[PDB]
Design a protein around this ligand. Structure first.
Ligand SMILES: Cn1c(=O)[nH]c2c(=O)[nH]c(=O)[nH]c21
Ligand SMILES: Cn1c(=O)[nH]c2c(=O)[nH]c(=O)[nH]c21
Ligand SMILES: Cn1c(=O)[nH]c2c(=O)[nH]c(=O)[nH]c21
Ligand SMILES: Cn1c(=O)[nH]c2c(=O)[nH]c(=O)[nH]c21
Lengths: 295, 295, 295, 295
């Protein structure tokens, strides 16, 4: 039998960093959860009990804290690239590093209509993530994403004209609620190395901001023919705004809100144009995905 | 053996309601999760298999939807009072109704710097809750609360001068991170019945807004001597601003962020005044509670 | 304003202890999650920023580990009583200790049809818990419980003869699925102090075993007229088997499994006597409670 | 811009099925959660708002229930293959179906030392899963797995001889606790179609049983040199026992239990050979993976 693939490392490493401006006294915090998995010439640790090739996962954890202490942790695309590059340069037998970072929100509080210097609030569970794969001799591949962005529109969503056969009971509709949790990922063109990633630093935050803005505006303004149609419009726009992106992927659940027929009770009217009270459904849910690239 | 206490009903009933202003075309959504438990002369369903005294939990579910269709669902203090009163008036053998409502956030989206008519975003998992106990002949007792409000301040929190004995290892500090998830509850004076609850309707939203504002401002501005001291200041203020509140209760976890000593690595300085990178601790956590009333 | 009630302490303290029999070489592990909250003359920490009265929550954490090192951790009723008694005896101004312990399952593995000396498996998420309140001058009050015991029976459950009115749509049934997650609590007679708790040590594990056995056998064998009726039969039996219990409380969700009408598809028969495929409902759920004591 | 990849369908479809033996009166239940995603000539639903190519996700849900009603649901490898084949044969423009099934445990209860005919218990949260990809013209690819199997051994695990450099603080050890949640996947040789899957039906349950048995025995009996070494031994054995498996993949977290130094308290000895009380760590955790195939 043989080892076809192997990777190992440390997951769920929580890190917080504070930056203090001695001038203004203003403080800014960053909190993330980091995972680093390594690959290389490590097969013998599995096959011959040879631990000599293993950089202990505890040491990988130490390295994450040390790297955060000596480098900026934002944007996460840069921090991930520095961290991944460290491992492949430091250890001759390690040839790839896979770094996943989830950034948690700590938004500056406004007290009395004005930004507080050192107090923050977690406004929603939405995350900004990055996946960075640093492979010796093959550069740096970065996928950036936003996830956990939950939205709902109460009208201006339709779903009619779908295939109807002997398995179909769903009625066509011209006015429904649409609600989803957005997961959007944009994949960057391959970078030759850290120097190239550093040269594009300003584009990272800007592109995340654009992806978020296009998602929200399109969802709110599109008179949606389907989740499929609306998501394609979002991806099209993002690709048009940033040339250094190769593909955009969206994965959207369709979280159903059902009408409740109350006519059995005193002829109460609560369906169609009279629908006011709905039952949110926890499961099942539609799941719609698409990856859009350049023609 | 005998039945000392008994209650039964329906939990986890998800409800959504939309209000449409035909004039402006503006739509407003409300989403909540409701639990209703009843008490009364129902012992025989337990002791003699007598189902005749049971209002089926499925019927309680129907009743929640019907009541939401025919009444306003906001503020939740009023909706809960209407729902609880319904059961005790409708069924002669039911003498108490206990209604718990959790309101989920659906905040109107701003697109292009302006409120969208029918699109919403879930901004944080913070909840506004109510517990309403409607007891025949004893009026209506309402406890209102906010929970899941997660905040952090990066400085201006101290903890020194605590008891030191042979079980103590904790070092005193004059500058630490303070982070918590706020759970605050204000208990209203007993109301004689629905008419009295209706007479105070405007105070409900106003008091929730005040509780939230006082919590956030006090947390941000207090140079905290301890969680105990800071929380007492919050409760004091709320009681001073609303006479119809009898008590205010706070329950605050102390979510620890530990310094990381990196001196073993090239003499790197990351403790005390040089602390920049911290390790958030998932567990254990301090838990501090207090109930403040009027003297 | 005044402090009406106050308690503080450490939550989510995970503890593991191993016992090694040098004779047989057999090892036994115990893993629990502990919470300790104290009450006493501590108001001034809230009102005057006086930390001198505070036993730091970090010290409470240290104390839990030290106590587990020097005492048996089983049965949890005894360990909780020792831990709570420690605080009220040690600190003159602390007058009550509230200890909650959740015991996690680590069941010895059987390899080749025989008990392994030092390997264990977590067989289900069911917990054994205790709540111990040690109050100066008022003895020790112990509530023991089992929770997270999930069961289902596919027939021999009925529900008919309930109240029918204009809010009712539910059909009567003589054959349905019954599924629930059992939460059962038995409250012991008050104990005068540690000496008395030690004198009854053998009854703790025995009573937990009896409660579990009676719950499982009654659920399996009762031709259930309702959740209410079946749960009362369980509580009756437990009270009859252990005199030192004052009350037994059960809290049971009714986790619904709905029939699916497939007749619209080629006249397929899947309801009533022909029901084979069902849809488990995640929410809402019935919730039925009862506390049974001695007449 | 162009559609590079697209898939859509229904997730989180809960299904329960009961089988009743009219002879013995014995009943057997199966409960699963199913996800089906389709691919094919559906780009125009995204690009031109053409819903005519969409088999509604609600219809996919109906199809899952109908298929479960007319076919056996066990082993899940067969049920998944039937369900996936249905879509590609039924709809000319659908060319691939991806079916994921999670099977939940409902284990027959033993009452009075004997199997009950219709009562079951959920013994642990461990799952048996399958992923089936049915691709037109390319056969059926099946990956089977077990996950959520949580185990711990209190001794007979070592970790020494790993790389030591300026990032290393971890001490070598010859006796530690090892605990993990096992996720094991075995990938079958490609099958030409349903007929071939049906011909191997008996191997599915047998191979799952073997994978589970080999995992448990190896974990318990190996004097582990590392997680890497122990997991490789498991995969080797499974491959040797079933020729129709091409690869075996394991993904194992290393859930740390730390020693607690209590020497600061009255010289208490709780480290090394005297270690009895440990602190389970919720995060971070090592994560070790490997895919083993045939040489
Ligand atoms: C309600 N609904 C389905 O049943 N399928 C689908 C789909 O593919 N896309 C939708 O936008 N909605 C929807
Ligand atoms: C850090 N810390 C403890 O250990 N105990 C306590 C307490 O009671 N209150 C605090 O504000 N912090 C704190
Ligand atoms: C199905 N069902 C209800 O609707 N109510 C009730 C109840 O009170 N008790 C039951 O056992 N079942 C049930
Ligand atoms: C404790 N520990 C580490 O720090 N790394 C590793 C590793 O790769 N493998 C282990 O078995 N343990 C371990």
């Amino acid at each position: 039998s043989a080892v076809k693939a192997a990777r190992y490392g440390k997951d769920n490493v929580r890190v917080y960093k504070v930056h203090k401006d001695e001038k203004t006294g203003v403080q800014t915090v960053y909190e993330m959860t980091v995972c680093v998995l390594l690959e290389g010439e490590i097969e013998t640790s599995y096959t011959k009990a040879d631990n000599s090739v293993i950089v202990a996962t505890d040491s990988i954890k130490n390295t994450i804290y040390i790297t955060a202490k000596q480098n900026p942790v934002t944007p996460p695309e840069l921090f991930g690239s520095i961290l991944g590059t460290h491992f492949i340069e430091k250890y001759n037998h390690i040839h790839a590093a896979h770094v996943n970072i989830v950034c948690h929100r700590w938004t500056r509080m406004d007290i009395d209509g004005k930004p507080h210097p050192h107090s923050f609030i977690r406004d929603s569970e939405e995350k900004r993530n990055v996946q960075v794969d640093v492979v010796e001799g093959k550069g740096i591949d970065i996928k950036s994403s936003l996830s956990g962005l939950t939205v709902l529109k109460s009208t201006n969503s339709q779903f009619w004209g779908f295939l109807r056969d002997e398995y179909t009971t769903l009625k066509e509709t011209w006015d429904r609620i649409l609600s989803t949790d957005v997961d959007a990922t944009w994949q960057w063109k391959n970078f030759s190395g850290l120097q190239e990633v550093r040269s594009h630093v300003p584009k990272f935050d800007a592109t995340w901001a654009t992806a978020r803005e296009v998602t929200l505006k399109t969802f709110a303004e599109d008179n949606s023919a389907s989740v499929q149609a609306t998501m394609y419009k979002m991806a099209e726009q993002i690709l048009a705004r940033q040339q250094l992106i190769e593909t955009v992927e969206y994965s959207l659940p369709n979280k159903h809100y059902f009408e409740i027929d109350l006519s059995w009770h005193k002829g109460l009217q609560n369906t169609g144009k009279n629908a006011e009270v709905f039952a949110p459904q926890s499961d099942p849910n539609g799941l719609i995905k698409c990856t859009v690239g350049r023609s």
